[PDB]
mmCIF file of C-alpha atoms in Angstrom:
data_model
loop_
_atom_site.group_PDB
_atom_site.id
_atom_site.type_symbol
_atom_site.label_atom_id
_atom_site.label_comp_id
_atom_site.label_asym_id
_atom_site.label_seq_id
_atom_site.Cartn_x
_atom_site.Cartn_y
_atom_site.Cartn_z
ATOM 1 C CA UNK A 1 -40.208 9.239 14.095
ATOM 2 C CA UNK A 2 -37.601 11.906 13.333
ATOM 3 C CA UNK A 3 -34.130 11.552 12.285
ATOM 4 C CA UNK A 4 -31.818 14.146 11.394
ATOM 5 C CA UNK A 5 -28.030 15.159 11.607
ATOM 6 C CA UNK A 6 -26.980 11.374 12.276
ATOM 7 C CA UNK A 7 -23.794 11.969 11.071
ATOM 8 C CA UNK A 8 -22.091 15.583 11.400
ATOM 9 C CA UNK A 9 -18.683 17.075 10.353
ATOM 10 C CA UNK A 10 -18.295 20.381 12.155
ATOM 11 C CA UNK A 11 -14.966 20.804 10.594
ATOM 12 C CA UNK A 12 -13.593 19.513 7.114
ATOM 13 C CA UNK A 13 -12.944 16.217 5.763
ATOM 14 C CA UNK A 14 -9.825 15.687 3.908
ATOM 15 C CA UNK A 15 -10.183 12.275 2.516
ATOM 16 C CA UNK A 16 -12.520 9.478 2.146
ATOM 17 C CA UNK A 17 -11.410 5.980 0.570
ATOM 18 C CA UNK A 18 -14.721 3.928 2.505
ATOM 19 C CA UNK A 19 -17.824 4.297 3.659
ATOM 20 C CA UNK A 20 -19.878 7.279 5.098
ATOM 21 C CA UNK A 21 -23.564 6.472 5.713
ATOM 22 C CA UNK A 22 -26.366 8.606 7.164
ATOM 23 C CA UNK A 23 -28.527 5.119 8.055
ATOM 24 C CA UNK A 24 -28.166 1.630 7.064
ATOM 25 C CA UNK A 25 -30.720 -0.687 7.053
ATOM 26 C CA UNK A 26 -29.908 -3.394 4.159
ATOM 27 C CA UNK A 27 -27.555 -4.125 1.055
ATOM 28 C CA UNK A 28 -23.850 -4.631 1.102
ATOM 29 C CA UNK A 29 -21.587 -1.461 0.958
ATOM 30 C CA UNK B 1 -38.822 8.913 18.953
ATOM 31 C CA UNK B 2 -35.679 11.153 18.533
ATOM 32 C CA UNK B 3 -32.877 10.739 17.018
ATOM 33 C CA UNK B 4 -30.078 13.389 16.208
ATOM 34 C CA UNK B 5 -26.423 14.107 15.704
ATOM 35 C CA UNK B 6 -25.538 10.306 16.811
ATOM 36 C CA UNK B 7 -21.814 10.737 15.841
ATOM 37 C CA UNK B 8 -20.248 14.054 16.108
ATOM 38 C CA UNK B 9 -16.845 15.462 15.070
ATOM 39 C CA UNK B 10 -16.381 18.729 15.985
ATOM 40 C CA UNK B 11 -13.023 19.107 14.636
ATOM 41 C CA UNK B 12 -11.278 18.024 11.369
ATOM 42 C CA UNK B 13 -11.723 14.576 9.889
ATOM 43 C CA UNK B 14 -8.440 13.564 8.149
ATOM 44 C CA UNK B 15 -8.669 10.110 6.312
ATOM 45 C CA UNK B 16 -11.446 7.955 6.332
ATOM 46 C CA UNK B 17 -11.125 4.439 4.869
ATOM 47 C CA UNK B 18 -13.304 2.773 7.212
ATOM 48 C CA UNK B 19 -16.977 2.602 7.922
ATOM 49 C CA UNK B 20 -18.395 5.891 9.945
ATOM 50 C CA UNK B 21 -22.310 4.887 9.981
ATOM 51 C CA UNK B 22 -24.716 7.312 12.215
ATOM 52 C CA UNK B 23 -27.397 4.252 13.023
ATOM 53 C CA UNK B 24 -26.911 0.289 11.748
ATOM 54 C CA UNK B 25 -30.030 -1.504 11.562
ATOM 55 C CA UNK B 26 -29.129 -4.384 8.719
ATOM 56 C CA UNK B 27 -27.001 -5.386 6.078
ATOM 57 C CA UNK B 28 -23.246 -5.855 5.547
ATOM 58 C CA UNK B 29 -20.347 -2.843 5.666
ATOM 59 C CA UNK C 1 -36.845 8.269 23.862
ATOM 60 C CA UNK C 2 -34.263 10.598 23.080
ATOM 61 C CA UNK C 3 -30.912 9.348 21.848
ATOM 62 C CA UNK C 4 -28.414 12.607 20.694
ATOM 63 C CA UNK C 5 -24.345 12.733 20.917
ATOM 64 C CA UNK C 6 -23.808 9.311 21.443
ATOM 65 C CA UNK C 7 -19.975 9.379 20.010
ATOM 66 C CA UNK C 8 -18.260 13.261 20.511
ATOM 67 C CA UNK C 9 -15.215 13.819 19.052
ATOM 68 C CA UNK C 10 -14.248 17.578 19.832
ATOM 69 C CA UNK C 11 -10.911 17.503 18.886
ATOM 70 C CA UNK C 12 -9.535 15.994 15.456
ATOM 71 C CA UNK C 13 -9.821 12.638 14.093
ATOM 72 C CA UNK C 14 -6.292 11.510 12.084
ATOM 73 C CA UNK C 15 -7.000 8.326 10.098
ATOM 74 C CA UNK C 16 -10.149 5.822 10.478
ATOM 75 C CA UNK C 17 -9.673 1.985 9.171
ATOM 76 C CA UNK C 18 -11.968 0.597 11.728
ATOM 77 C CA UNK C 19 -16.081 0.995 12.429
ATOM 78 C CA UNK C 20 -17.281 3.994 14.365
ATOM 79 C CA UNK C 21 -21.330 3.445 15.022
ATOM 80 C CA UNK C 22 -22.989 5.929 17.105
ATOM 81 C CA UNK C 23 -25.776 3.244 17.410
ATOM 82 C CA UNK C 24 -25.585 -0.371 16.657
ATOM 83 C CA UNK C 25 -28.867 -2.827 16.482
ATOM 84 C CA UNK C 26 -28.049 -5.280 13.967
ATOM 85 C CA UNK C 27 -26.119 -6.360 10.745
ATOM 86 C CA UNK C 28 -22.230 -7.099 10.612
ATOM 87 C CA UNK C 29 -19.820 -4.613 10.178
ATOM 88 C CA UNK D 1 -29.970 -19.100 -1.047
ATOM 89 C CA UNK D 2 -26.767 -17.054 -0.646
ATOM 90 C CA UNK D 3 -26.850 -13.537 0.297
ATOM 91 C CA UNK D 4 -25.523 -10.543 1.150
ATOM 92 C CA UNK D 5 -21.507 -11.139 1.751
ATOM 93 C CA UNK D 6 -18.616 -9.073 1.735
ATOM 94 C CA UNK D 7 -15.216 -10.435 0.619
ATOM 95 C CA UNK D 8 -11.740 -9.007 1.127
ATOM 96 C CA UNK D 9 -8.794 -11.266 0.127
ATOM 97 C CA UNK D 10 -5.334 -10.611 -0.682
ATOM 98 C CA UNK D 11 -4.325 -7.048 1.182
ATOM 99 C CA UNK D 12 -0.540 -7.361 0.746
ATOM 100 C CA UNK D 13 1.360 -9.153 -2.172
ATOM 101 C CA UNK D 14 0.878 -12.434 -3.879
ATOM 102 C CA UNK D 15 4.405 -13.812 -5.010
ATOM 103 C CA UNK D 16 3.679 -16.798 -7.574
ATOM 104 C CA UNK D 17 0.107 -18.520 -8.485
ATOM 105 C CA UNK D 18 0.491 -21.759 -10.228
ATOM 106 C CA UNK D 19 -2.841 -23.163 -9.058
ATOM 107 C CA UNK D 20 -6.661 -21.506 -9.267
ATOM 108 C CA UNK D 21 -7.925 -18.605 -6.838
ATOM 109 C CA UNK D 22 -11.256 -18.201 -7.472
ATOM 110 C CA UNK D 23 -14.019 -15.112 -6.435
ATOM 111 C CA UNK D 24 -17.666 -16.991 -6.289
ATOM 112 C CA UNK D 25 -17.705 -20.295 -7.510
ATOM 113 C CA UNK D 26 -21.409 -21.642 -8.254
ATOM 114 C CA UNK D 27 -22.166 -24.973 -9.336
ATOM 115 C CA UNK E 1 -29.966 -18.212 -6.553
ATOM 116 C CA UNK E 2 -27.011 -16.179 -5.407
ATOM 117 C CA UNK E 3 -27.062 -12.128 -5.675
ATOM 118 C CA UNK E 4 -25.796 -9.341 -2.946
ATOM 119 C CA UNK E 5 -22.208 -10.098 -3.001
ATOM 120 C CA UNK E 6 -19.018 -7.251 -3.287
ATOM 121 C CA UNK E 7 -15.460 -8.989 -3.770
ATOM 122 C CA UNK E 8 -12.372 -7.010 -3.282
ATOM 123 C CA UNK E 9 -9.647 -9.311 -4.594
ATOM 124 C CA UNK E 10 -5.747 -8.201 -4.500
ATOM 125 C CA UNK E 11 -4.952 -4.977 -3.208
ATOM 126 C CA UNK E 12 -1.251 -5.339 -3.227
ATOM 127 C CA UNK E 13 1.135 -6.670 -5.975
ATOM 128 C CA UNK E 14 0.259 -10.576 -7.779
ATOM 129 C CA UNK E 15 4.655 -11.389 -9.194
ATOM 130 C CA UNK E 16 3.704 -14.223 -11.351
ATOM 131 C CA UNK E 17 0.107 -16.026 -12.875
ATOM 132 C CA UNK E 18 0.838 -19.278 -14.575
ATOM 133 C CA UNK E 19 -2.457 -20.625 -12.821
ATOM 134 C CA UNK E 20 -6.436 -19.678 -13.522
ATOM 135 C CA UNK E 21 -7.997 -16.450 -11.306
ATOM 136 C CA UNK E 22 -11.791 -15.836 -12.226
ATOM 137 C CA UNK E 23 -13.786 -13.328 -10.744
ATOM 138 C CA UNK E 24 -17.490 -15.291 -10.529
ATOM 139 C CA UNK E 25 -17.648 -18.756 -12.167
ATOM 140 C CA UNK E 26 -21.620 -19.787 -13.452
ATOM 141 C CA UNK E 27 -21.425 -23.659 -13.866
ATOM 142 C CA UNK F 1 -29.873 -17.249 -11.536
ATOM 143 C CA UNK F 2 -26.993 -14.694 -10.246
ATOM 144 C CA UNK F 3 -27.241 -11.477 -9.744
ATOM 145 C CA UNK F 4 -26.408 -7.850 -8.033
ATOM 146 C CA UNK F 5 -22.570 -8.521 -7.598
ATOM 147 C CA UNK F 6 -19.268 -5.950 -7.652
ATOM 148 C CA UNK F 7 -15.620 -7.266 -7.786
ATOM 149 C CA UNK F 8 -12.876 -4.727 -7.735
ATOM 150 C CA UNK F 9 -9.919 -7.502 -8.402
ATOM 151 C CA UNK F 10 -5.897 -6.343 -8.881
ATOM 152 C CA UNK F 11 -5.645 -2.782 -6.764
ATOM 153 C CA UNK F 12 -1.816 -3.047 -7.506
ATOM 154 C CA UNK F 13 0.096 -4.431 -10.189
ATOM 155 C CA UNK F 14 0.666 -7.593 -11.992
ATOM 156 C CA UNK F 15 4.142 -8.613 -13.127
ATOM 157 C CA UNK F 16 3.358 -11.443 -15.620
ATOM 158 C CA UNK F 17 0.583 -13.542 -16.719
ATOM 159 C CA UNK F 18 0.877 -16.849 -18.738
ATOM 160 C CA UNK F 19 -1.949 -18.495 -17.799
ATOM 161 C CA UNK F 20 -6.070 -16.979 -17.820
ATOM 162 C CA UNK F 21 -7.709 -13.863 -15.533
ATOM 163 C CA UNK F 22 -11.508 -14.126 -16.509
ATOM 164 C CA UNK F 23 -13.379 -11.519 -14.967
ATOM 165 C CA UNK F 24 -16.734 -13.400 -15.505
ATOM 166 C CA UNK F 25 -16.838 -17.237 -17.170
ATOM 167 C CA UNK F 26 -20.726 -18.209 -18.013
ATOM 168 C CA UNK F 27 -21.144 -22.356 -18.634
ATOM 169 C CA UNK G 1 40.094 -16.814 -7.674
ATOM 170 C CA UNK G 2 36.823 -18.765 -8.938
ATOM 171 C CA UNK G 3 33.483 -18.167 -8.261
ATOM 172 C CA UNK G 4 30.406 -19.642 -9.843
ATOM 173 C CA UNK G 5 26.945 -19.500 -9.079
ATOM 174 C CA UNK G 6 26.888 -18.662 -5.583
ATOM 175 C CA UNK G 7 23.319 -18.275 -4.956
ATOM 176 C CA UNK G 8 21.178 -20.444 -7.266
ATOM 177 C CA UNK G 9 17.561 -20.759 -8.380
ATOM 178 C CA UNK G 10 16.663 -23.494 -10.427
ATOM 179 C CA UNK G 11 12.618 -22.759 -9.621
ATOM 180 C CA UNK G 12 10.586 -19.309 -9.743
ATOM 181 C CA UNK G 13 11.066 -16.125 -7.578
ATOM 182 C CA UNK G 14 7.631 -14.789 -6.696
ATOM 183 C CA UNK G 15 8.621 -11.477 -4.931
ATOM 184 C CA UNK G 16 11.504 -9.955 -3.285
ATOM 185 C CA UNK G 17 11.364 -7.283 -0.427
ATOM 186 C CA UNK G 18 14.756 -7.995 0.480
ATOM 187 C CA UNK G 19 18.303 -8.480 -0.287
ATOM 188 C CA UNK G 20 19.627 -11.243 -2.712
ATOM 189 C CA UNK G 21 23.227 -10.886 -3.097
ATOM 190 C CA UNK G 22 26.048 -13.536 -4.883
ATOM 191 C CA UNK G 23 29.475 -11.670 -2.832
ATOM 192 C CA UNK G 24 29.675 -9.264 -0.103
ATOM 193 C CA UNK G 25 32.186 -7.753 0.827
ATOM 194 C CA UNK G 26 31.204 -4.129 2.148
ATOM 195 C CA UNK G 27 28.659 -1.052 2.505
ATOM 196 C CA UNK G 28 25.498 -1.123 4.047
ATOM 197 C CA UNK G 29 22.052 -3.274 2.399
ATOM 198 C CA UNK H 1 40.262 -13.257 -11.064
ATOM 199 C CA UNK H 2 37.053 -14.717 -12.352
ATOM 200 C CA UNK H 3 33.661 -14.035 -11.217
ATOM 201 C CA UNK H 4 30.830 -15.624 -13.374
ATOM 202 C CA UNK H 5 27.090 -15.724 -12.447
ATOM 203 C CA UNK H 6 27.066 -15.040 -8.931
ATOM 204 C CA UNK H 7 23.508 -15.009 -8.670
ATOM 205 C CA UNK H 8 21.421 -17.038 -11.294
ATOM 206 C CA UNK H 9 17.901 -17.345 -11.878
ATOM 207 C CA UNK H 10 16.791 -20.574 -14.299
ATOM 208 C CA UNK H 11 12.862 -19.939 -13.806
ATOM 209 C CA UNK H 12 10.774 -16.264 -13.582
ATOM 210 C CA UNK H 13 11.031 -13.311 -11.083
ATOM 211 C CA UNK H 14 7.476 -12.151 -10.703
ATOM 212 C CA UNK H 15 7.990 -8.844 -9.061
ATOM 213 C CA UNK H 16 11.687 -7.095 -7.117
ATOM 214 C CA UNK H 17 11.134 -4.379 -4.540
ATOM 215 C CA UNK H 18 13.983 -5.242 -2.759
ATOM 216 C CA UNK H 19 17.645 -5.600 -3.796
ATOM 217 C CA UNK H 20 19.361 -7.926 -6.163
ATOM 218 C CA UNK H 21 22.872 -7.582 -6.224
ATOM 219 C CA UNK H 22 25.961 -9.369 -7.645
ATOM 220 C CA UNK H 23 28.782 -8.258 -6.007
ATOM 221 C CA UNK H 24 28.107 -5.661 -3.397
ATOM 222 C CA UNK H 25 31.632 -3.933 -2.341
ATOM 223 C CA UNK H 26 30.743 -0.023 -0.946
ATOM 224 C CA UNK H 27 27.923 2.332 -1.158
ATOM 225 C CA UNK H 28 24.728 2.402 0.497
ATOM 226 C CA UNK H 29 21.268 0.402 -1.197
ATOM 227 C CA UNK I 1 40.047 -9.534 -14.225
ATOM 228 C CA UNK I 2 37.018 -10.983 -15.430
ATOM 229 C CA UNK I 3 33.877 -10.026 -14.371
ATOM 230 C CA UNK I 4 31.038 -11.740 -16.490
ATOM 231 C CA UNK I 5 26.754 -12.146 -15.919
ATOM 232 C CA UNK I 6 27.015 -11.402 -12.336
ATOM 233 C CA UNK I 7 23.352 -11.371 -12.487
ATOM 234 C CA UNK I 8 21.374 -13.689 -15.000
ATOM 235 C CA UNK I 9 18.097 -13.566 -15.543
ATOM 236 C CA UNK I 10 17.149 -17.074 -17.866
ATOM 237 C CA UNK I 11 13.552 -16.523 -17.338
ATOM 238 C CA UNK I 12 10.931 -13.227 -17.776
ATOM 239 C CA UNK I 13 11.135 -10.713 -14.882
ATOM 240 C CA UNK I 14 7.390 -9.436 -14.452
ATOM 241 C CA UNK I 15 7.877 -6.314 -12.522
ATOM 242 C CA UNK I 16 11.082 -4.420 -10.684
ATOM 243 C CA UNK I 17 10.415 -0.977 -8.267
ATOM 244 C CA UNK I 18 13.380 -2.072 -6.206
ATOM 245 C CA UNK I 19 17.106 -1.938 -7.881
ATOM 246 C CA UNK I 20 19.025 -4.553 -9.845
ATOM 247 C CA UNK I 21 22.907 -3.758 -9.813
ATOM 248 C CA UNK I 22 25.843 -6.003 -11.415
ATOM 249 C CA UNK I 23 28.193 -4.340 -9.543
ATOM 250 C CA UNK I 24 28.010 -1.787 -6.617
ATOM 251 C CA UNK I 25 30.937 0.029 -5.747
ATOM 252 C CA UNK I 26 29.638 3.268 -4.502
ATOM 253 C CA UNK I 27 27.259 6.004 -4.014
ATOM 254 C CA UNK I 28 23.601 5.538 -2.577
ATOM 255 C CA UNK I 29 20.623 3.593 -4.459
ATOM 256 C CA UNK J 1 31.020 15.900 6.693
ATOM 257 C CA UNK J 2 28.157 13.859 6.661
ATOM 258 C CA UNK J 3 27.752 11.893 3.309
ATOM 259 C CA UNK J 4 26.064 8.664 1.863
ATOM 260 C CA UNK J 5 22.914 8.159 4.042
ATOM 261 C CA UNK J 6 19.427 6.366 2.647
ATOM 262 C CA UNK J 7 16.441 7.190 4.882
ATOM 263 C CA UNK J 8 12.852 5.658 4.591
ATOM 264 C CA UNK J 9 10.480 7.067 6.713
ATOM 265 C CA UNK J 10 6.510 6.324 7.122
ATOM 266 C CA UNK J 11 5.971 3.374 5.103
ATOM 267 C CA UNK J 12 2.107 3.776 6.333
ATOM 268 C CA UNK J 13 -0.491 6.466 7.510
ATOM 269 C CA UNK J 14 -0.075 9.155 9.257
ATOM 270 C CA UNK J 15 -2.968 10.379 11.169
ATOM 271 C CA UNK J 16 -2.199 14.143 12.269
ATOM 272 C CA UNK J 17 0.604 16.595 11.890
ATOM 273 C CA UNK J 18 0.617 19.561 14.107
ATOM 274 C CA UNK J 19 4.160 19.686 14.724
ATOM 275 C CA UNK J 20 7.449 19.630 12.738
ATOM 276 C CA UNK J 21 8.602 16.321 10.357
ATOM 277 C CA UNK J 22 11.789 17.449 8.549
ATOM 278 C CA UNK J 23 14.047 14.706 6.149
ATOM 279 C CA UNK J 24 17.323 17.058 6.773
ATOM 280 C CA UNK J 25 17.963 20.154 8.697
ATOM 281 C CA UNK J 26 21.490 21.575 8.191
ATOM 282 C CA UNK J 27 22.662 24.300 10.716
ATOM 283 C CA UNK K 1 29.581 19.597 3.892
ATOM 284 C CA UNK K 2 26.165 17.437 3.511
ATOM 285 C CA UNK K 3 26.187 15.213 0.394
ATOM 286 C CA UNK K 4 24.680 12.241 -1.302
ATOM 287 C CA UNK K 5 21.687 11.182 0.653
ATOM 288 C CA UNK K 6 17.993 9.331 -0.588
ATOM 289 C CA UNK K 7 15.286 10.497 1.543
ATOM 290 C CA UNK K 8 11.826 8.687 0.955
ATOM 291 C CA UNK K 9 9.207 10.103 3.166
ATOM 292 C CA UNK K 10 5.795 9.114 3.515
ATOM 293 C CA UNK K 11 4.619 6.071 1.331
ATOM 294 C CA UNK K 12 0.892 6.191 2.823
ATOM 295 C CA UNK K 13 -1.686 8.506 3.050
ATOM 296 C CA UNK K 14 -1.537 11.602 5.510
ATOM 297 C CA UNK K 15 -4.832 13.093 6.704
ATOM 298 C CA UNK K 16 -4.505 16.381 7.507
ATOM 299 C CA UNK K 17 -1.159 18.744 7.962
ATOM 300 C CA UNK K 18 -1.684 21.927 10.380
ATOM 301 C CA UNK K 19 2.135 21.982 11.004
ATOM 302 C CA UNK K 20 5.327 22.166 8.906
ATOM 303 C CA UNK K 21 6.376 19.535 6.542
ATOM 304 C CA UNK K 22 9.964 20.494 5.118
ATOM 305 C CA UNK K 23 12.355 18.012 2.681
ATOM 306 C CA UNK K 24 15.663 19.805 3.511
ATOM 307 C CA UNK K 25 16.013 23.278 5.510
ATOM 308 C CA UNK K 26 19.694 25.037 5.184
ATOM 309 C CA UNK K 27 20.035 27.469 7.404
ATOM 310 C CA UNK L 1 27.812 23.617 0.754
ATOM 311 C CA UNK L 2 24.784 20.755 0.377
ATOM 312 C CA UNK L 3 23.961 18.650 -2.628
ATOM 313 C CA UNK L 4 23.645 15.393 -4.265
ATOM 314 C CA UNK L 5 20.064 14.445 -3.176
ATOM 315 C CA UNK L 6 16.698 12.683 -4.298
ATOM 316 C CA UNK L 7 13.770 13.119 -2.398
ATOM 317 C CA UNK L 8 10.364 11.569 -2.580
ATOM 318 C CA UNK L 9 7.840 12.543 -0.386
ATOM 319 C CA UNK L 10 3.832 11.471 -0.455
ATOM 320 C CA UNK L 11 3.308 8.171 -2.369
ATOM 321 C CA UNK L 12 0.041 8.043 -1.521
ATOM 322 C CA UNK L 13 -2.792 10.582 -0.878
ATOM 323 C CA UNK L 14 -2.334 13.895 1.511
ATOM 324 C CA UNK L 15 -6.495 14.403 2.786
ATOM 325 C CA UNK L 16 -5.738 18.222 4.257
ATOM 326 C CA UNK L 17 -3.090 20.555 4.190
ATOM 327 C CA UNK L 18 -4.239 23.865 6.438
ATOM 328 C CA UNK L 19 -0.098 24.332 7.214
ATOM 329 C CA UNK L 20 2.871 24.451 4.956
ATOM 330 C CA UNK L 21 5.013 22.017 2.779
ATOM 331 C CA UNK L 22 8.049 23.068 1.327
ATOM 332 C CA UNK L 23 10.404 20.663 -0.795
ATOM 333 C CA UNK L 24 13.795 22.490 -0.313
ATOM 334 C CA UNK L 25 13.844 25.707 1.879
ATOM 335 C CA UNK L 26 17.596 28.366 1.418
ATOM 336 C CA UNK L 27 17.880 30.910 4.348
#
């Protein structure tokens, strides 16, 4: 089982006001 | 089992107020 | 099983207020 | 048993409450 | 038993309150 | 028992209040 | 030649996004 | 000749984001 | 002649971010 | 002449700017 | 002759600016 | 000849500026 680079931002990211998640798998965000 | 780079921006991410989430298994966003 | 690139975005991304998943099994967004 | 929920109310303006708005009411 | 909850309430302008708002109410 | 909550209430603002905001209200 | 209470609230304004006027007569709301 | 409360509020304003005017004659709001 | 309370307020205002004018002859609000 | 003008522009987001947005452009 | 004007310009966010963004531009 | 103005520009939040912004701009 190998996961990596599930999310990936080449270029910049100005702003963030919600959610950025790699995996998600329970809780409330 | 492989899993890489599942969302890819290759340019510039402005505003995010939403959810970007590579893989959703459970739970609430 | 090999799952890579599901969402590209090669050019720019202005504003997100919705969901982008690159892979969605279960949970409510 | 009550789990895991997400709650969003009120995105624009509220003009005049004269009653009760309430979160999570329990028991 | 109630736990796991996130409550966003109001995100634009309340004018007036002459009523009750609570967040979380325990019996 | 209650546990494990957030509650972001009031993003913008509030003109008046003359009656009660209780952010948590136990028995 | 007289003018009384030409718009009238006996109750409670909760919010105004618009225009309340008594007397128009010109210009641009 | 006699202009007396054109516009009259007897209860509470909560919140204005609009205009409130009494006589409105020239200009631009 | 007379120009008296064009606008009365007999309660509490809570909050104003628009304009209140008695009288608006001119210019740009 | 050019007098007495109120402009409101882009009550919301804007996503991307790669051209021009300009309130007034004289000559 | 350009006189008296209110200009209110952008009230949201904006997420990214790669062109030109100018209030008022004589000349 | 220009004058007589108010402007307001970016209420809320700007995320990336890579070009230019420039509030009044002579010649």
């Amino acid at each position: 089982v190998h996961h990596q680079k599930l999310v990936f931002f080449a270029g910049d990211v100005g702003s963030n006001k919600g959610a950025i998640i790699g995996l998600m798998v329970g809780g409330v965000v």
